[PDB]
Design a protein around this ligand. Structure first.
Ligand SMILES: *[C@@H]1O[C@H](CO)[C@@H](O)[C@H](O)[C@H]1NC(C)=O
Lengths: 48, 45
């Protein structure tokens, strides 16, 4: 992982560019990523 | 003068009450701005 930098990423086949930081929100145990009301990806779970 | 001032003070009280319930003209401008931007971003998919 590389937190707090603009990086290009691939989490388990989900890809993008952005800055990664530790979230206050928490998913259900089967959920893998979050989307907002516009359907952009706003959060992700680290597979490791 | 006493009666006129009492009617005025009473009428302001009813405005304050009514506004604690009418802003549709302002709210729908806010709604239309947001709805247009959400449409513009959804349309990228
Ligand atoms: C993945 O492996 C590491 C190193 O052994 C371990 O600390 C971690 O708990 C493991 N995580 C999962 C989800 O298996």
């Amino acid at each position: 992982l590389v937190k707090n930098k603009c990086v290009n990423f691939n989490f388990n086949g989900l890809t993008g560019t952005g800055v990664l930081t530790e979230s206050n929100k928490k998913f259900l145990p089967f959920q893998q990523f979050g989307r907002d009301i516009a359907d952009t990806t706003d959060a992700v779970r680290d597979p490791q | 003068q006493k009666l006129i001032a009492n009617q005025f003070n009473s009428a302001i009280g009813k405005i304050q009450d009514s506004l604690s319930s009418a802003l549709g003209k302002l709210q729908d401008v806010v709604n239309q701005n947001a709805q247009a931007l959400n449409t513009l971003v959804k349309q990228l998919s």
